[PDB]
Amino acid sequence: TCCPVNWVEHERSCYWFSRSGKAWADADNYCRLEDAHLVVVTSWEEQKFVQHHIGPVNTWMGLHDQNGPWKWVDGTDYETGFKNWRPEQPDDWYGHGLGGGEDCAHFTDDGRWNDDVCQRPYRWVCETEL
Ligand SMILES: O=c1[nH]cnc2c1ncn2[C@@H]1O[C@H](COP(=O)(O)O)[C@@H](O)[C@H]1O
Ligand SMILES: [Ca+2]
Ligand SMILES: [Ca+2]
Ligand SMILES: [Ca+2]
């Protein structure tokens, strides 16, 4: 009863799943304007719940290394926290030829994470805490 309309409640958090794509910085701005942040996944249980609602689609999360080390957007510690990288990721790939490596994390079609080019338009998930 405390999540906004069209948001999904799960373990004291509210989630909004986009049905359109945006570059990471744009999806980040979108979530912030809803008094929310790009989804911060801290457990296997929260990972399975997000997977259920996104399906087999590349989807941005609130994890990036644009300024150096890996950081979650709300300040949640990366080093000591949950990780679900696909084997061989993050790899900071430059071979896409678009400039730079790969600095934004997204869920891949099977749920496991990948670092990709932040400019790519992907769907995204916003999260707010109750
Ligand atoms: O041609 C390639 N060479 C090396 N790695 C690649 C190549 N294409 C894609 N990748 C890797 O695969 C990731 C994309 O994962 P996907 O979007 O699930 O296919 C990229 O971010 C790179 O890590
Ligand atoms: Ca969370
Ligand atoms: Ca990087
Ligand atoms: Ca990658």
From Swiss-Prot:
Domain C-type lectin: 10-127
Organism taxonomic ancestry: Eukaryota, Metazoa, Chordata, Craniata, Vertebrata
Amino-acid positions noted as binding Ca(2+) 2 in the UniProt annotation, renumbered to this chain: D65, D92, E102, D103
Ligand binding (Ca(2+) 3): Q89, D91, E102, N114, D115
Function of the protein: Mediates the endocytosis of plasma glycoproteins to which the terminal sialic acid residue on their complex carbohydrate moieties has been removed. The receptor recognizes terminal galactose and N-acetylgalactosamine units. After ligand binding to the receptor, the resulting complex is internalized and transported to a sorting organelle, where receptor and ligand are disassociated. The receptor then returns to the cell membrane surface.
Protein modification: Phosphorylated on a cytoplasmic Ser residue.
Superkingdom classification of source: Eukaryota
Protein name per the record: Asialoglycoprotein receptor 1
Tissue expression from the record: Expressed exclusively in hepatic parenchymal cells.
